[PDB]
Design a protein around this ligand. Structure first.
Ligand SMILES: COc1cc(C(=O)O)cc([N+](=O)[O-])c1O
Ligand SMILES: COc1cc(C(=O)O)cc([N+](=O)[O-])c1O
Ligand SMILES: [Cl-]
Ligand SMILES: [Cl-]
Ligand SMILES: [Cl-]
Ligand SMILES: [Cl-]
Ligand SMILES: [Mn+2]
Ligand SMILES: [Mn+2]
Lengths: 348, 352
């Protein structure tokens, strides 16, 4: 009943879809075994790489496939195209920079090969190693120029450091050079923040992911990244990591802090936070197959700035696709949401 | 002709009852300063109270003055914004950070008596919520009873964590037993995050009301829901401000991922609940719009929670803005719903 081909009036383009490489998962296992994994890696990957639960075992199998099985799963849910990225946390936590760069290179080449096999079904976002910003700049260019990628995904913090530090500037410089978006995908919080969430079972997708990622996007807005780089587009999933809902409070309290000189890293910005959401931030509904939240975000940010995403294989649910197809939205809005926003912002 | 007038007395068709309004006592602020000076203050106290107690900014200095008044200046400020009644609580973090239990109990007792005196003096304007010292849950239970029976209070406000500990721990159970005995709501108000969580927010200027408050408080409410507090205590009502600390917006993801975790037996701590998280929002959680004078968010939350479960709050004096009251008065919302929002929901849930 869910079919590819666009007969219902739009293609379904899923914009936050994950894969893994066996060798990178094996590094996570090595780090867990040797005690160099952070608490988030132990929690997240200690569970999915080892748990006998149905959910974990199917996730791992699906993550690792970039071929016929993935295509069959897409076909079964009417998903025409998937924008693919190496699953969080990528190579960001790795302590050996040579290893991180080598494995990122291999993951990027593996993804490029899969997109070359299925160029009408798979679209790639590159993975990088922000612990080396200039290498990451090189890899942004290589992905854009040689591999056919449409941007990059960064899995939030790198070893507890955030992208608003000047150190990471080459990444943004390069994204603006190639004119591609950055998708800031969640990760577990760093060890500096995770403990109260971890103890309650809240460190992952239920809560901690949104804390980490919303914080990361907010700190980039408030350091002025979009004044420095006015063309830059940053995408986030999960209905904007709560920021659209918080918007009134974000702007009120941001302004209060700026005027009162409360913080060194909070100085005047050229736009309000609302202004940046309307011009520089893009959101997907990954994990949020929920009409009132989607409509809220369309209203606040503009319906051109909200895109469909499935979050395969972490949230692979045929009934969610059906619920999205059935929303009380005009045909014209629905086609933007499922297809034409992604075509614009990813330059498909 | 639109007016700038904001009048007490209910002539718009409702009283304006503000449900998250703060005051301070000088002696408790002086303890914060002492803790900052002697190095026993946590990073959040240094950030928050180093700012309000010492900043020369216009905003901080006016806030500190207003916090300390429980009399004619506060009443005039309410009159000037058409606020008929204020539900008052000792400002975060209260006595929760204090290491000396005797000092915490003594200062909380004094703050509660000071509040009760003010409510007795202005009984049609001021309504009290008690402050407690969760470091001593059994004393706190006695103080919940004293507030309800002797002081005329309508519930208690707890300023989220106590020294890095959360209310889902069994240690704090006496507080819940007492709330159910007096049948009163708990307002979980924000605080700065504990030292175990604050660092990345603090460095960016995000530890306070802009962001970290919502992280801390939403986490705390979520922890309580997922430990099963409302299965243990089905009558218990927990109130939160700031449009539900994002939880209403996250609801689909909360329930989906809560279920995923329980079904995969991922966390020994996270076990089956009798209701969905959505179910608990509709039966056991209540929300105010403190800091969120914003129609789309209010309406969203009214749809998720039910219009009977969302109340007006000003967050005086941290967010004292006449234009916000005007915007709220003029929302495209039925008279009946608007009256619930401003007046009758609070009258029900606080038993006014
Ligand atoms: C490791 O990558 C993910 C993990 C989960 C999960 O543990 O359920 C969800 C998402 N997500 O974006 O929500 C992920 O991409
Ligand atoms: C110390 O108590 C508060 C502080 C602030 C602030 O720093 O602006 C905001 C709220 N509030 O609830 O948002 C307070 O109650
Ligand atoms: Cl009176
Ligand atoms: Cl701590
Ligand atoms: Cl009960
Ligand atoms: Cl399972
Ligand atoms: Mn994802
Ligand atoms: Mn408040």
């Amino acid at each position: 009943d869910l079919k590819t081909g666009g007969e219902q009036g739009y293609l379904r383009i899923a914009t936050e879809e994950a894969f893994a490489t066996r060798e990178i998962i094996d590094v996570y296992l090595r780090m867990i075994r040797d005690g160099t994994a952070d608490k988030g890696m132990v929690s997240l990957w200690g569970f999915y790489a080892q748990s006998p639960s149905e959910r974990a075992t199917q996730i791992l199998e699906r993550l690792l496939d970039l071929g016929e099985r993935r295509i069959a799963d897409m076909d079964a849910t009417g998903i025409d195209k998937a924008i693919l990225a190496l699953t969080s946390p990528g190579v960001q936590p790795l302590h050996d920079l040579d290893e991180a760069r080598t494995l990122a290179t291999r993951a990027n080449d593996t993804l490029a090969d899969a997109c070359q096999k299925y160029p009408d079904r798979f679209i790639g976002m590159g993975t990088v190693a922000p612990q080396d910003p200039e290498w990451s700049a090189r890899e942004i260019h290589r992905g854009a120029r040689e591999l056919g990628f449409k941007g990059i995904q960064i899995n939030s913090h790198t070893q507890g450091r955030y992208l608003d530090e000047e150190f990471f500037d080459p990444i943004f410089r390069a994204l603006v050079e190639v004119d591609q978006p950055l998708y800031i995908h969640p990760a577990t919080s760093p060890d500096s923040m995770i403990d109260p969430m971890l103890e309650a079972g809240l460190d992952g997708a239920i809560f901690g992911f949104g804390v980490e990622t919303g914080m990361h996007l907010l700190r980039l807005i408030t350091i002025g990244i979009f004044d420095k780089y006015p063309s830059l587009q940053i995408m986030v999933g999960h209905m904007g990591e709560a920021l659209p809902y918080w918007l009134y409070r974000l702007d009120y309290m941001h302004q209060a802090g700026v005027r009162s000189q409360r913080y060194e890293r909070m100085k005047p910005l050229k736009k309000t936070i609302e202004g940046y959401l309307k011009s520089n931030v893009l959101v997907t509904n990954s994990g949020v197959a929920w009409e009132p939240a989607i409509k809220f975000c369309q209203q606040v940010m503009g319906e051109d700035r909200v895109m469909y995403a499935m979050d395969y294989p972490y949230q692979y649910v045929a009934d969610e696709v059906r619920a999205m197809d059935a929303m009380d939205m005009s045909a014209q809005t629905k086609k933007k949401f499922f297809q034409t926003n992604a075509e614009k912002w990813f330059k498909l």
